[PDB]
Amino acid sequence: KLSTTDRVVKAVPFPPSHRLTAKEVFDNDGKPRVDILKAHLMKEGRLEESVALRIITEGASILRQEKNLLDIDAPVTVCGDIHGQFFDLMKLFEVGGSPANTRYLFLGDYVDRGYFSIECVLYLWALKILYPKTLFLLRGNHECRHLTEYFTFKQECKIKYSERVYDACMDAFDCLPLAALMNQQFLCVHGGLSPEINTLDDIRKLDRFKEPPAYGPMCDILWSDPLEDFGNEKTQEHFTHNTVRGCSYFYSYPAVCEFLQHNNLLSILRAHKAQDAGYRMYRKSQTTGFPSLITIFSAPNYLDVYNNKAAVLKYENNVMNIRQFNCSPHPYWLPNFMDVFTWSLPFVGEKVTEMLVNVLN
Amino acid sequence: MDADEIKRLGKRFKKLDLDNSGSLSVEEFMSLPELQQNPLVQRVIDIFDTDGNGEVDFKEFIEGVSQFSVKGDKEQKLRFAFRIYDMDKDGYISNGELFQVLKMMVGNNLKDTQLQQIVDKTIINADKDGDGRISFEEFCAVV
């Protein structure tokens, strides 16, 4: 009958066990081979620890030289949360364009929730090494030690690589810029505004090479949210305690409009919030006639249950083109990277005990 | 084992031996209503069938329950659980049998693609000598 040694579902490719070496990941010039890396990571392949550490540290060195507030000219494809959905990230670049001929800006949250977070980091960092001046990465609230230890990113690193690789990621995440000034019109951040931030210079004078503090303007950039009644403003306070995140604040429609007018900004582009269509246009500013706030979310079918769309924002030729895309298949992991023996053994001992009890009566 | 237990198991063995053949067939095990929906019945029967004739004689029936004695340490519980997965009884858990045994337990709770993927991952993450199969030592380190 069915072989006890050969694989039953032969349609599933057996993942490669080899770990790529430095000579196989970096070419003669020292540039990463993103084609090799993409194909290998899509098969759930792994790199040698030293190679993974080299990608993380080399990418961190490029990030380390960048300012807190990036200056990015149009055209550019702005992207929201990825949350470790590496196979949806492959679809994202198909939708937005290849980084070989397309400028990109990512608003953070590359890790946690999805179970391919380290693949997302390695591939984005390699792209950052390859395209240091056309592909840009901002920091999200999940690129920190506080959250990756509470969620699955640290466990993911220890299963696929080592805690040393995790530790290298934490130091790299500290180098991530906090914000971007895009085409002199849009302030691009992960979370939103801060009561301690009223000008662009308030962002520039920040010290970002650290773990995000529990309070302060750096925390607010990464954690803040618009009011649930944004636009329908009955709460006349500009900043109130964020009861959903447990820290930072909610910011109101008057707060955003005042900031935009004080800094001559058209809109604020942010992420940090799952959306059914992958995007949300907030109430227009009476001063500009343009939406004061835009949320972008690039993780489709979030947590494999939300069944939401994802979108990126392609700004080119004075056109704000929203591009939606659906989720893609990905290999299956048991929750919290549990193996099948630890998963099934309590069921095994239970059913064999029931049988023995009913046979012996 | 205990003499009182030996006599009780002989009485139960007779009630299970419906055709009075001196050996328990798979159909005779399935006659019990609690075992009709237990997805591990066929695995335990094969484990007890140490000679491979498809049936369980009284000698196999005694030695099968002897392993479930309270005088067995945790290793005795893990060795029996190991044999649940090791269908071909070669001392190792291979890919096909691990999938098949898991498929019996999960039924429709996982599609075949998803199950094959986590079976692959477990074998890769647990095989420490490169043979491609999971020995009992490798099985202990995981559980």
Binding site: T288, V319, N321 | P39, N108, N109
Partner: peptide
């Protein structure tokens, strides 16, 4: 429990390209 289960210039114009 009969089966093992899984554990728990002018203004910019805004345009849309729906999925697929």
């Amino acid at each position: 429990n009969n089966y093992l289960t899984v554990p728990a210039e002018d203004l910019p114009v805004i345009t849309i390209d729906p999925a697929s």
